[PDB]
């Protein structure tokens, strides 16, 4: 709630839909076993329900998207970065879904004055995109800015 990362919520909102690709309503603990087996983790029976009843606050063992933000605020324990590129990420992005996208990065070289072709701006993303989804994360934007 007061975790105060507006662009990580837009990351978590895509991340929450990964676990809940199965079904429209929220996580059902077999919907977590489906994505755990997709990684080949093969978790034991009756260890899933334990792994969800230690994140769930309000009974009803299904965990929902408000409760999902509680756990990820507790992890990724805390970062006090320069706060200037976090302002510049929100002006490079003009749709505000927390992803830079494939085309909007070409939409800023066209405005900054760089003659950059369609493939080379696609080459800019592939270097920047750790999870490889084709749109750079805000954290990928930070790791491509101040890490060097």
């Amino acid at each position: 709630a007061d975790q105060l990362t507006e662009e990580q919520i837009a990351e978590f909102k895509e991340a929450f839909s990964l676990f809940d690709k199965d079904g429209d309503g929220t996580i059902t603990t077999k919907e977590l076993g489906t994505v755990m087996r997709s990684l080949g983790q093969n978790p034991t029976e009756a260890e899933l329900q334990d792994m969800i009843n230690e994140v769930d606050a309000d009974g009803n063992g299904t965990i929902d998207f408000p409760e999902f933000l509680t756990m990820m605020a507790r992890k990724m324990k805390d970062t006090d970065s320069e706060e200037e590129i976090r302002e510049a990420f929100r002006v490079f992005d003009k749709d505000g879904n927390g992803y830079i996208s494939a085309a909007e990065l070409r939409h800023v070289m066209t405005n900054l004055g760089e003659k950059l072709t369609d493939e080379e701006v696609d080459e800019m993303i592939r270097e920047a995109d750790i999870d490889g989804d084709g749109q750079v994360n805000y954290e990928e934007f930070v790791q491509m800015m101040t890490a060097k």
Partner: protein, 627 residues
Amino acid sequence: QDWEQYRDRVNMLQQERIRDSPLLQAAKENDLRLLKILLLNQSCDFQQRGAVGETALHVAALYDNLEAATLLMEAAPELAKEPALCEPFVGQTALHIAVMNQNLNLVRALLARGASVSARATGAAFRRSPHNLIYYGEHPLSFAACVGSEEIVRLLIEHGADIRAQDSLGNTVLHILILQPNKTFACQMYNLLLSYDEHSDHLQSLELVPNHQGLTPFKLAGVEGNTVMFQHLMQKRKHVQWTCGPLTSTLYDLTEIDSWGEELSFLELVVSSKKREARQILEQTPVKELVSFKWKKYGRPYFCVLASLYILYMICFTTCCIYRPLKLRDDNRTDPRDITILQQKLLQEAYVTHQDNIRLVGELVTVTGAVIILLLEIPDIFRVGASRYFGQTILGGPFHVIIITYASLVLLTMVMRLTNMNGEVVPLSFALVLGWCSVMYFARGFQMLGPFTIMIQKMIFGDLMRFCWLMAVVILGFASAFHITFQTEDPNNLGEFSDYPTALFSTFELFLTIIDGPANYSVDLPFMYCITYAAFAIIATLLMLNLFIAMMGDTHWRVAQERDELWRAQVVATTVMLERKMPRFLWPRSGICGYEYGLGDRWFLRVENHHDQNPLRVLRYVEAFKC
């Protein structure tokens, strides 16, 4: 006096009235020992206020002052019920400004005294306008929803803020979230506000409460281009069927996207919206698969039938212009002013041949082919807005101006005939160069010719006009200087500037290197002409004409990406034009309905995507679960 200069003085006059009293000065400075000594003896009428009309509770709440507020609420609890009274701040009470600064305890202390949580703030500084920096609405629940503070919002539902309450523009609180700049927080405030929604209401649900111009909140996101709020409204309209490994087959609801029986459809309001971000709704995952299925299955052959019906029509028009009733002229042209060379006049009224009866059946096609245009383009003027229609350049744009000006000139040459008017050549030749360059409208159906004919539009307005203002300046300076030096010269040997209209025309033709440089090597041209010509050869056809290729060469790749997603918004906007114009014999209702596959009577559409099974986007989140 400007209206920005009026409110600038009131916000400075508020500062003089705060310095005027020791109370309001102690209201904002928190000096409680200057507060308590004042309102113990001679308890003033606290009706003394600033020029905004704001009480001492308002000044002590406009600044984050917990203590100075509560001292003014103990000795006078009737300050909590009073609004501001000046004409740009009508209705802003002390609860509103406490909500705005997110002062959590100041909301509780005001709510414990029974503050009116339905106080409308009808000031001229609160309405939605291009002049006001934030539009938050009127009710203080709406002021708490658009600051991204969930604790104030839960505090006003428990004290009875009516969530279905709408402001003077008709916007409910779920509308004003969609007009917010911080688009990712209002998606989470949509989930908070629907959790407090009235269960089993008599009227519609709060996701469907219309506006005072008729916009549902789902319809408002498509107008304002709030693509993040569009995908959160499509969360409650998809039903994930199965996930067969990597694939996922979802089933979109498509009732409020397609909007079958409605005058102004959802897709009509998206492609015609003045927002530049409105075109991005036509790339979201239930709409991109919808308007392409409307285009590939019906929309593209029903355009090519229409694109080939028009080029067959315009061929019949020119063939009835080339053959036109001309007779030989008898008025011995070398007798009246032998400069003139007319030798065909007109026919008065005579169709009595055989090879002109086949022309009259062709002419009659052009008259009924013009009035069809003035029957299918004239009622469309008033339903879009008569200037929003001629200038939106997504739904036709500057082709409806051409297609009507052409069709008038066929109905104008019909008046030039049937009355034996002499100037028949004037409205016909404007009708051809407007009739043929309206075949360019049907270039939007083809990917080869589609994005290019936007660039001809984006250069003939933005870039040809900024050049042709800078050449009417220049070629008036050299046509005047060419009419000077050849007024004293003989027009029989060098007649390129015999008249001042021809001097303006021959100077415009020289600039484009069309006409050769006017030189007669058997006579001596005046030396003043050659000095003016070397400057005209350098300024006009070295610098300016080649800077034009440079500038248009520069502003082509600047808007090469803008022209590409403007054509994808143009194939959608001609589909929605064609689904509305063509009869319902054509265009069956898009989607698979559910009356036989039983889940309702809504018309569903299936989208099956292949999302990659990349582990790096999942392994970070299953490790925060395991450890």
